[model samples]
Target: SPTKAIVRLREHINLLSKKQSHLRTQITNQENEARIFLTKGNKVMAKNALKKKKTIEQLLSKVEGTMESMEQQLFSIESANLNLETMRAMQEGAKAMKTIHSGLDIDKVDETMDEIREQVELGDE
Candidate 1:
């Protein structure tokens, strides 16, 4: 889909998912404090924690929406690219999409594991 377009958008989606996980944990932290303060009989601190949690929930919703948009865009590109190859038989068409999809699926797995196992070791070495 337009020369490296797949790889390009895949990285964006991958990074955004990483940020999504971060926001999720921060939301959990806020909830932890909200309850901690409630238990200590400090209504003001509990209220503050809930306020922070509310704002972060708003941000998390926006991030999820953006990720959906990126996925839709990627699908659109693949659709258009395949349509242009209409003259080709179903055999080639299915094979093409499958191969590309497989490669695309592998990118995220590689990205996450690369960090967990080691860093910069894959500095393209």
Candidate 2:
């Protein structure tokens, strides 16, 4: 379950990262298009392009904040995963030792038991 959580968190971080890249590309393209329109001397089209560029700029600002937050979240998730891995390793080690100890105790008890008597033996014996 913890592993699944970590995987999901990584997926979320990747998705957000991709979204940030897409937004950046969109901003660059929009700005370039606006410049081309201006160079062509299409005043009306250039003005429209400028308006679009401004809108994209605003959107980029918001996305930048979101990207910052996502990056922080990704860092937190990575830390959490590291902690979880350490704890899980400890738990597994403890369990393995416990199993070994229990097996030793069981073997000792079996050795101490009285010899099997045919009359007391069950069907499977």
Candidate 3:
């Protein structure tokens, strides 16, 4: 079901958001660590921390891209569901029209026409 898939996607998106946040915090801490090491004149460790921060940023950007793609997929799924519902309603309407027409055969239509002619003749002076 689209609904089920939507639910699962929503759940996974939320999880990804949480992971993104965690990565963001990790990057923040790495930056802070780098700043501290730089202040103490430990260029080697500061460089390493900056390198780690860059890696985390890359992952964060990738997660954001994935989230955007998933959101678009969700939109398409919702639109498809709406289209299916519209088609189903149209089908039911066509069926109802067919059933209603079944109650009025061509033979009965001609009979009604004759009755109308008879009434018109009787009304004539």
Candidate 4:
């Protein structure tokens, strides 16, 4: 179901957003820790934390990018589906209109109008 897919798409994006925020805080804190270790002249420790931080940042960025791409594609699909549905409805409506009009034509209208005029004239007489 496109609707279900759309609904879940929102969920996935939101889930990624929350994770992104969490990772952001983690990565930022890692920076502080690295600086702290560096000040203490513990280059090895600082390097270790920063190394792990790189992976976290990368993962978060990748997730955010994936979500952004999915969001765009989802919206495009939704709009395209809506346009398709509308065109189908419009086509059916035009068919219905044709069917309604097929029951009669200009000659019938003219004949009916002439009968109505004759009736009115007879009534006046």
RMSD, candidate 3, Å:
7.2
Local accuracy of candidate 3 as per-residue lDDT tens digits, 68-91: 888889999999999999999999
Q: Which predicted model would earn the best lDDT? A: 3
Give the higher-TM-score candidate: 3 or 4: 3
Name the runs in model 3 displaced over 4 angstroms.
101-125
- For 26-120, candidate 2 gives per-residue lDDT tens digits of 87887788788878987788778768878877876776677677667767877998998999999999999988766864356544454454435
Between candidates 1 and 4, the lDDT winner: 4
Could you give candidate 1's per-residue lDDT for residues 18-104 as a string of tens digits? 989999999999999999999999999999999999999999999989989989989999998898778577768899988875686
* Candidate 4: tens digits of C-alpha lDDT, residues 52-122: 89999899989889899989979988998999999999999999998886667555775778888898899
Once model 4 is optimally superposed onto the true structure by TM-score, how far is the C-alpha of residue 122 displaced, in angstroms?
Answer: 47
Ranking by TM-score: 3, 4, 1, 2
Q: Which of candidates 1 and 2 reaches a greater lDDT?
A: 1
Error of 4 at 7 (Å): 0.7
lDDT (Cα, 0-100) at 32 in candidate 3? 100
Report the lDDT of model 3 for residue 113. 82
- Model 1 is weakest, by summed lDDT over 10 consecutive residues, at 101-110
Regarding TM-score, does 1 or 4 come out ahead?
4
**What does the lDDT read for residue 67 in candidate 1?**
89
TM-score of every prediction relative to native:
0.67, 0.49, 0.76, 0.73
